[PDB]
Amino acid sequence: GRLHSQGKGISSSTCPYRRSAPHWLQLSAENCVQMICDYAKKGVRPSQIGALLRDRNGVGMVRAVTGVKVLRILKANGLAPALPEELYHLIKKATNVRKHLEHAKHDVDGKYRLILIESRIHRLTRYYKTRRVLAPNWKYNAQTASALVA
């Protein structure tokens, strides 16, 4: 957590050393492509989809089944989200904290942290417009915030 902050974090997952396996379990390449697409129909973000398979269907790495990452499977079938997931959550956070700063405007700690989210988005939207996921003409305003999250 080093970006907009004082602090040096180190805390995350570490992938298992062997991508292949495990023979001991029991799962299939074709059956797992159905189950990913199962949840994405009902409106879940790929960050949560892998976690449901981990905690229901004992799927450690989903790659280690299919040979394929989760977002590729959705885009292969042709049914991912339109916005990136990291971008979606920030604009959904930033519209909510701006809703708060209407009501009571004295918390400058709210204002200071409205920037540093609004700042984070303008970094990401640049990155995604290079990869050509969002078209040049796409924008983020206060008026256009609720249109994109919905």
Partner: protein, 82 residues
């Protein structure tokens, strides 16, 4: 003993004591536990850390329940290593 430490082939103690990432091969300390309520006879897989509270097919109450680290085993429930 600051100068001499053997770091190619360390002890079994020292691999467990060092951090998840700091080991010579990095790989996690967390595995899929098999589980069983003595009510049922159906053998349920689960991820030890979780996030989601675990149920079997049949009953209703969660088999394991979420904290920070490992799953908190509610009731008398047991683990079969497989």
């Amino acid at each position: 003993t600051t100068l001499d430490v053997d770091i190619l082939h360390p002890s079994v103690e020292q691999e467990l004591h060092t951090n998840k990432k700091k080991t010579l091969v990095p790989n996690p300390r967390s595995e899929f536990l098999s589980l069983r309520c003595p009510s049922c006879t159906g053998l349920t897989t689960a991820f030890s850390h979780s996030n989601v509270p675990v149920f079997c097919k049949n009953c209703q109450t969660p088999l394991a329940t979420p904290t920070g680290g490992r799953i908190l085993l509610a009731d008398q429930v047991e683990i079969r290593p497989r």
